């Protein structure tokens, strides 16, 4: 029910120019639907299912590098390696990286960040 | 130098509370947290504040997830040394509140994580 | 090799800025951060980008919290080794910007945290 493990965080753009969504709820459904498909497909391959909590956001960077004024519409995906389901943390990590790259490809993103953070998970069921 | 932060993820249980918007879910969960944190504070003098964020959680539809994700909330907070004198008792308190939130939101499962953090508090 | 991420939590000060939606607050804080980060970059060549999320912060009404929570914003960012040559200088830049944000948002207190993180950057 408790133990040291890893969480991940990925930040992606929503690519309005390609998908033409017009609200943050539409953007969340877009990214969430892609994550759902790729996570299920990898689960069928490796028996490792990576669930993700997805949050709306704006990412602020220099307008001279392409950022809209007041920020780019983005989505933050996070998840934790639950030892109830993950027997091998290194395989899970490699799965997350694989999914992050697939998300970057299918979202047509030029760059993407994927972070791993040490966490102590308490799981109540 | 280092302290802890927590992160809890819960469903919002629209079917039970009959809320109709993510804004209503935030007020619902906020009010529940506000009440349970106050109640615990009056027992132990340990107040656990929480930053609450809207979210969706994506998992396998075979396990009950709606297409594109379940509506969820993320609650986070930090053990501020200004207010916290015993980190172990603070962790116990977060866990106690996380279990109360799980019960009141009628959740079958719930995650509560602790992450090491370096807090700079400006006042 | 780990790097750092930061997390800042701030009020949105609806009463001072006369905003009436979370979207308006997000754009306002986003513009304020964009300006202070650009000005700092023009001096030090350290650009601190930030991912900003809407939120509500729940604390004791006895200390001034509104019922169900205060409207807040969470700003996070990562020290990407592709652009950050000196982590200490980056950390001091984040702290400097957090203090500027506190002043410009007219906040009485503000938290700024640093968390160790393993960053994979795909380009
Ligand atoms: N900090 C920096 N210092 C110096 N130059 C920079 C910096 N950032 C960007 N640049 C320039 O811009 C070019 C593109 O860089 P990049 O796409 O990485 O620049 C990114 C970061 O500045 C920021 N960002 C991304 N993930 C973040 C996270 N987890 N936390 C905080 N901020 C985040 O967001 C920027 C744009 C991304 N959101 C991607 C935008 C778009 N969807 C795309 O795919 O191209 C670089 O090659 C540089 O020339
Ligand atoms: N990763 C997995 N691998 C294998 N089987 C799984 C997995 N996840 C769920 N299952 C199956 O589904 C059953 C239910 O498991 P569980 O309720 O824990 O499955 C949860 C996780 O997959 C995901 N989730 C929850 N917290 C998360 C976090 N912090 N980060 C990332 N994802 C998070 O969300 C799922 C459902 C929860 N949101 C709760 C749903 C609902 N409100 C409820 O109370 O039952 C399990 O007994 C398994 O049979
Ligand atoms: N935990 C506590 N225990 C005991 N006394 C407390 C506590 N918190 C606040 N107080 C009392 O209230 C006064 C003000 O304290 P403070 O402004 O720090 O109290 C803050 C925290 O309780 C909470 N908060 C802020 N950042 C947070 C984070 N990252 N995670 C979780 N919660 C967060 O939010 C409270 C108010 C802030 N959002 C600022 C509100 C307002 N915008 C302002 O600028 O004054 C203190 O001097 C004490 O008298």
TrEMBL record, chains B, C:
Segments forming a coiled coil: 87-118
Entry keyword set: Coiled coil
Recorded superkingdom: Bacteria
Protein's name according to its UniProt entry: Uncharacterized protein
